[PDB]
Write a protein that binds this ligand. Structure first.
Ligand SMILES: CCCc1ccc(-c2ccc(O)c(C(=O)O)c2)cc1
Length: 141
């Protein structure tokens, strides 16, 4: 399933980003790709992400769910490309790091489920057309 596969990759990435500690072939290769591209993306948007995180004040699970409802509407507006999808997942990694920092580690998995919901609920057909995670891997390399 698209949702299950997406969640496996996204949860693994957010958790390893937060703790600093690390279809299996596709999932493995997508995670590796995401480690490489997500790194440049997080650094490129660092100040912006910090600013957004500040205003949002995400400190518990309810806040995570609250933010996801708004993200769904924003992400569904405008163009769709892999770079924007990586940007969404990178913001998720950024938030995940913040949650670990403030000792709210229990919120990381719900955040991963919310980021995956944002992605799959709004871009399911685009993802299927682009060949899912295999498409992702092929696109970057
Ligand atoms: C009140 C603001 C809540 C909010 C915060 C962040 C986002 C966000 C993050 C990364 C993204 O890549 C995109 C996007 O691509 O649209 C959108 C959307 C809404």
């Amino acid at each position: 399933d698209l949702y299950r596969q997406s969640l496996e990759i996204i949860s693994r990435y957010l958790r390893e980003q937060a703790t600093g500690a690390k279809s299996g072939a596709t999932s493995r290769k997508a995670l590796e790709t995401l480690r490489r591209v997500g790194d440049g993306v997080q650094r490129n948007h660092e100040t912006a992400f910090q600013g957004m995180l500040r205003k949002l004040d995400i400190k518990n699970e309810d806040d995570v769910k609250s933010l996801s409802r708004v993200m769904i509407h924003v992400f569904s507006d405008g163009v769709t490309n892999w770079g924007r999808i990586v940007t969404l997942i990178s913001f998720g990694a950024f938030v995940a790091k913040h949650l670990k920092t403030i000792n709210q580690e229990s919120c990381i998995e719900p955040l991963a489920e919310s980021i995956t919901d944002v992605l799959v609920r709004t871009k399911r057909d685009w993802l299927v057309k682009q060949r899912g995670w295999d498409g992702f891997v092929e696109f970057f390399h």
